[PDB]
Design an enzyme around this catalytic site. Structure first.
Site, PDB file in Angstrom:
ATOM      1  N   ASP A  45      31.555  15.386  19.797  1.00 25.96           N
ATOM      2  CA  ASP A  45      32.170  14.155  20.280  1.00 25.96           C
ATOM      3  C   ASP A  45      32.223  14.109  21.812  1.00 25.96           C
ATOM      4  O   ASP A  45      32.648  13.088  22.367  1.00 25.96           O
ATOM      5  CB  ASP A  45      33.538  13.915  19.629  1.00 25.96           C
ATOM      6  CG  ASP A  45      34.575  15.021  19.753  1.00 25.96           C
ATOM      7  OD1 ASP A  45      34.221  16.139  20.187  1.00 25.96           O
ATOM      8  OD2 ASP A  45      35.736  14.796  19.292  1.00 25.96           O
ATOM      9  N   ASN A  83      40.568  19.207  14.063  1.00 30.60           N
ATOM     10  CA  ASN A  83      39.777  20.391  13.873  1.00 30.60           C
ATOM     11  C   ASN A  83      40.259  21.506  14.775  1.00 30.60           C
ATOM     12  O   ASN A  83      40.051  21.434  15.988  1.00 30.60           O
ATOM     13  CB  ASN A  83      38.294  20.087  14.107  1.00 30.60           C
ATOM     14  CG  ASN A  83      37.443  21.328  14.136  1.00 30.60           C
ATOM     15  OD1 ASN A  83      37.689  22.314  13.411  1.00 30.60           O
ATOM     16  ND2 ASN A  83      36.511  21.379  15.065  1.00 30.60           N
TER      17      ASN A  83
END
Ligand SMILES: NS(=O)(=O)c1c(C(F)(F)F)ccc(-c2ccc(C3CCNCC3)cc2)c1-c1nnn[nH]1
Ligand SMILES: [Zn+2]
Ligand SMILES: [Zn+2]
Length: 231
Positions: free
Chosen positions: A88, A180
């Site tokens: 990302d 995460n």
């Protein structure tokens, strides 16, 4: 109240949001392990050029980001910094580099991206290897707060606007889970948040890696989220 949310952005489209004079966030969405998430980055005006912080999470999203900037702002993106090694933040670096954008990251991020099989920014940012380190890069200050979401995570401050972009080391206020944590340091994360709080006490806007911007409260909230995950 107008910041775009995940259900408002189809995967492949990018929105810009004006944060302050010469400061925007970029918002994209991406599918990962079968769920869709929004993700933020930053754009900072650098005279008649722009500095980009983080990709829009993927090649097609990053091409759409450049097209949105051309349409909405009309100044060229000349440099980009990725704030950690995950997709990302670096996914889309190859698109940036083909578009003539010079891409940068710390050596820690570059080594981790390489080991992960992720895209690798071209240029290495020295002077950020010790917690509390800060370097100037065009119109921003890059700050290494210590390990948090990842060992290499950087945060970015825009002194002209008192805007702090926390990347994935900072969660939005509605967060109830730590995301995460596979590469996180859950014990160091609150200490790294404390360092950010100490170094940027005048921050007016805090932008998380995912979700809605707010104020300085996102920092303490993030430490609280991480503590709830730990136990
Ligand atoms: N950067 S990352 O590696 O770890 C990541 C990736 C990636 F594609 F890049 F592979 C994919 C999805 C997410 C992700 C981002 C946010 C969430 C939660 C959403 C609801 N509110 C609490 C946080 C869950 C997962 C994350 C992430 N970013 N920050 N925390 N996790
Ligand atoms: Zn990450
Ligand atoms: Zn993330």
């Amino acid at each position: 109240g107008e910041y775009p949310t995940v259900n408002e952005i189809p995967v492949g489209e990018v929105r810009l949001y004006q944060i302050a004079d010469g400061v925007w966030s970029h918002i994209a969405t991406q599918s990962f392990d079968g769920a869709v998430y929004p993700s933020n980055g930053l754009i900072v005006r650098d005279g008649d050029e722009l500095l980009l912080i983080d990709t829009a999470w993927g090649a097609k999203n990053t091409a759409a980001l450049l097209a949105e900037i051309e349409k909405q702002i009309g100044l060229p993106v000349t440099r980009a910094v990725s704030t950690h090694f995950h997709d990302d933040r670096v996914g889309g670096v190859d698109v940036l580099r083909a578009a003539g954008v010079a891409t940068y990251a710390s050596p820690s991020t570059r080594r981790l991206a390489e080991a992960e099989g992720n895209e690798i920014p071209t240029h290495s940012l020295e002077g950020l290897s010790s917690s509390g380190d800060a370097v100037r890069f065009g119109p921003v200050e890059l700050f290494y707060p210590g390990a948090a979401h990842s060992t290499d995570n950087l945060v970015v401050y825009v002194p002209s606007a008192n805007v702090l972009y926390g990347g994935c080391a900072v969660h939005e206020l509605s967060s109830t889970s730590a995301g995460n944590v596979a590469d996180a340091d859950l014990a160091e994360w609150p200490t790294s948040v404390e360092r950010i709080q100490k170094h940027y006490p005048e921050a007016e806007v805090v932008i998380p890696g995912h979700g809605l911007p707010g104020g300085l409260d996102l920092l303490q909230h993030t430490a609280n989220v991480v503590k709830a995950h730990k136990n």
